[PDB]
Amino acid sequence: TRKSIHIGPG
């Protein structure tokens, strides 16, 4: 499940 937005390298 998605918690937030993902920013930057994974």
């Epitope: 918690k3 937030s4 920013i7 930057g8 390298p9």
Partner: antibody, heavy 113, light 113 residues
Framework: QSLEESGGDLVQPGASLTLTCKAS?????????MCWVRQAPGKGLEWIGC????????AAYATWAKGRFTISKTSSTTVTLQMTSLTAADTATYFC??????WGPGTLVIVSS | QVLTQTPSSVSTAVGSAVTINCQSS????????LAWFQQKPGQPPRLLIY???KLASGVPSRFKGSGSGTQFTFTISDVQCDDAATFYC?????????????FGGGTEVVVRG
């Protein structure tokens, strides 16, 4: 690895329009947060929504966009933004981004009669 | 979630240091999901800092971010003519209690040479 948006156009108020974000040098079979961001002429950046291309495949939207716009993964190298009921408030350059890190050059939408 | 960015503009000399602030109406996700961008006219945003203080690969170390929770600052050391641009902060938030993201309104940086 790069992104390119297309489908920007001049449209009448009330219209619908679909933009496409095309991936090059990689594919959406891996896990990324693919998001759309817009910018009205002379104004600031505004988040529209995202689609995860990994497990969960979650779509999420800004409250203002929710229910009026959709974002979906349409092939291993394309993500779309479908817009409905357009008004002058929607006139802007539309960018897509991968994890807010890789960005396209943007595509322009003008809503006017 | 509202991310208030100040000042809206600033003019500063080549060789000075310059600081921008961002204040959030609620804690960002994990207290550090916060990023800073640079945007020049006609171009897409460029990621400079993520996770409040981590430098994106290939970004000069005279760019620095700090802060946590709801209060964040961004500082450019040894300002150069090349830095003249608009800068933005972006917050990532808990999706279950509001919108997933919000941009600050931007700071225009003018550089005196």
């Amino acid at each position: 690895q790069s992104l390119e948006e297309s489908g920007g156009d001049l449209v009448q108020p009330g219209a619908s329009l679909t933009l496409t974000c095309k991936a090059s040098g990689f594919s959406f079979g891996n896990n990324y947060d693919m998001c759309w961001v817009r910018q009205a002429p002379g104004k600031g950046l505004e988040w529209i929504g995202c689609i995860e291309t990994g497990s969960s495949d979650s779509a999420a939207y800004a409250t203002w966009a929710k229910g009026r716009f959709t974002i979906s993964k349409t092939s291993s190298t394309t993500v779309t933004l479908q817009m409905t009921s357009l008004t002058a408030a929607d006139t802007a350059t539309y960018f897509c981004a991968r994890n807010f890190d890789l960005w396209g050059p943007g595509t322009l939408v003008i809503v006017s009669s | 979630q509202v991310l208030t960015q100040t000042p809206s503009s600033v003019s500063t000399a080549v060789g000075s240091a310059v600081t921008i602030n961002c204040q959030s109406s609620q804690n960002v996700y994990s207290n550090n999901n916060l990023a800073w961008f640079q945007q020049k006219p006609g171009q897409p945003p460029r990621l400079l800092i993520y996770d409040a203080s981590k430098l994106a690969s290939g970004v000069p170390s005279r760019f620095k971010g700090s802060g946590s929770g709801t209060q964040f600052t961004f500082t450019i050391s040894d300002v150069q003519c090349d830095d003249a641009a608009t800068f933005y902060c972006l917050g990532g938030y808990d999706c279950s209690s509001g919108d997933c993201a919000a941009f600050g309104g931007g700071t225009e940086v003018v550089v005196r040479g």
